[PDB]
Amino acid sequence: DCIFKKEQAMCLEKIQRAGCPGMWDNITCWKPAHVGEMVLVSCPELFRIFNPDQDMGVVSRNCTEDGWSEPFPHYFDACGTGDQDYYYLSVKALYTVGYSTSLVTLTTAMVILCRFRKLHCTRNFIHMNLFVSFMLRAISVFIKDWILYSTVECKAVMVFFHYCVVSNYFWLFIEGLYLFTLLVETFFPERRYFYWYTIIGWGTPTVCVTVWATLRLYFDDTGCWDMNDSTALWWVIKGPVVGSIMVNFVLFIGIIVILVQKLQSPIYLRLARSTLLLIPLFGIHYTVFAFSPENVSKRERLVFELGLGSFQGFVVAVLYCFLNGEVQAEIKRKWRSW
């Protein structure tokens, strides 16, 4: 039931093989010393989980004639839950329900899109690929949660999870890039671009997750890699995602300025409606908290980005499906044919 003892057990053998003899402490491990000579060590990094900063040595023990003096100054408490657990549990349930709703709505959407042969077009193909990315991202999150709540299976799950997230962020950026490209060049719009977009959307996540995994093994192979305390290693995965958010924001602002140039030809309500429609498809909500450090406004970020962010599927699968004029036309025609 308890695997904590395992590491402590070795101390016993070490002190029995090596007037104040070695004592097997449950809290730490003490080595024999001269009688009446105070011994000071540094508390194990297990106490330092609470305090991320560097550990300090303060814990000391005193010897006596035939043993070790009791720790009167309680040096264990010197070196180095309810509400937070409740918060994380409520957030967990919220994002779960949202991800399930998105999964279902995007499923029925994709099905409808596949059923109609008229709807098939490059733009729709990219929409379907984004829907596939969302499917992968939901299946990843759910599998990760099940496995998590040290082996190789859990590492493979963490890797598939990261890959799916990076794929979703890249497909959102490819969506914005595609629309911007169409606006920028009205003529000769596609030059094997459904191929370049497919490649850059399905290859770069694999490259970055492989790089991350290898760097992890070589430098910081700790546990199942769930925790990402190593800033350097985390930057490799983080960088492309902030870059995607920034570039997508810039492409979105370019589309907005092009649209407002078009609308002013010889309208604020229409622009607001267009922006409200475009924000889900480009994920303009991430830029709000992207600049914020993870420690700062952490609780607000984990609710806005994930708690409410879990319904992005539903939003894009209601704004961009079940109300689309083409979709409505085709479905009504099929109902009439029935």
Binding site: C2, F4, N26, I27, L46, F47, I49, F50, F76, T81, Q84, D85, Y88, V91, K92, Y95, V141, K144, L148, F161, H162, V165, Y169, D226, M227, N228, D229, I237, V241, E294, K298, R301, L302, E305, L306, G309
Partner: peptide, 28 residues
């Protein structure tokens, strides 16, 4: 990303809680 942030925070909270549970159990 938000999913990684939540996972790291939740795992750290679970580890800290378990460490506290062990420490107090041993103390008493």
């Amino acid at each position: 990303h938000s999913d990684a942030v939540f996972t790291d925070n939740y795992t750290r909270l679970r580890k800290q809680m378990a460490v506290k549970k062990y420490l107090n159990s041993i103390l008493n």
